[PDB]
Write a protein that binds this ligand. Structure first.
Ligand SMILES: [Zn+2]
Ligand SMILES: [Zn+2]
Length: 106
DNA sequence: CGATCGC
DNA sequence: GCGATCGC
């Protein structure tokens, strides 16, 4: 299982602004030791880049209507799936999504 | 030995 | 380790 076995970061990401999560629950989605540690380290720098969630590392909750049942936070979708070639840590491949947006696509 | 996302 | 949704 790739998502567990370790790797290193690649890809610059893309430039956005203060209203950057609105594009998570839209279409493709918003750009940006284990993926278990990389996700934290993503949202830990979301706190330090100018709330209580991100600061401890967790994913922030979404709007009520972009939630599906017990799925309620932002999700890092891999555009090109890992089983079919996709690089886990391709900062360029990861799309910030919401439970409903993510669900449709798949 | 489900895939794919979260804690 | 564990939890969630979808599954033609
Ligand atoms: Zn996905
Ligand atoms: Zn199962």
């Amino acid at each position: 299982s790739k998502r567990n076995k370790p790797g290193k970061a690649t890809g610059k990401g893309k430039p956005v602004g203060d209203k950057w999560l609105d594009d998570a629950g839209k279409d493709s989605g918003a750009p940006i030791k284990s993926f278990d540690d990389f996700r934290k380290a993503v949202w830990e720098e979301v706190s330090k880049d100018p709330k209580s969630s991100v600061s401890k590392g967790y994913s922030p909750f979404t709007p009520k209507n972009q939630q599906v049942g017990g799925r309620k936070v932002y999700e890092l979708h891999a555009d090109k799936p890992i089983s079919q070639g996709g690089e886990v840590y391709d900062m360029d491949n990861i799309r910030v999504t919401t439970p409903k947006r993510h669900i449709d696509i798949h």
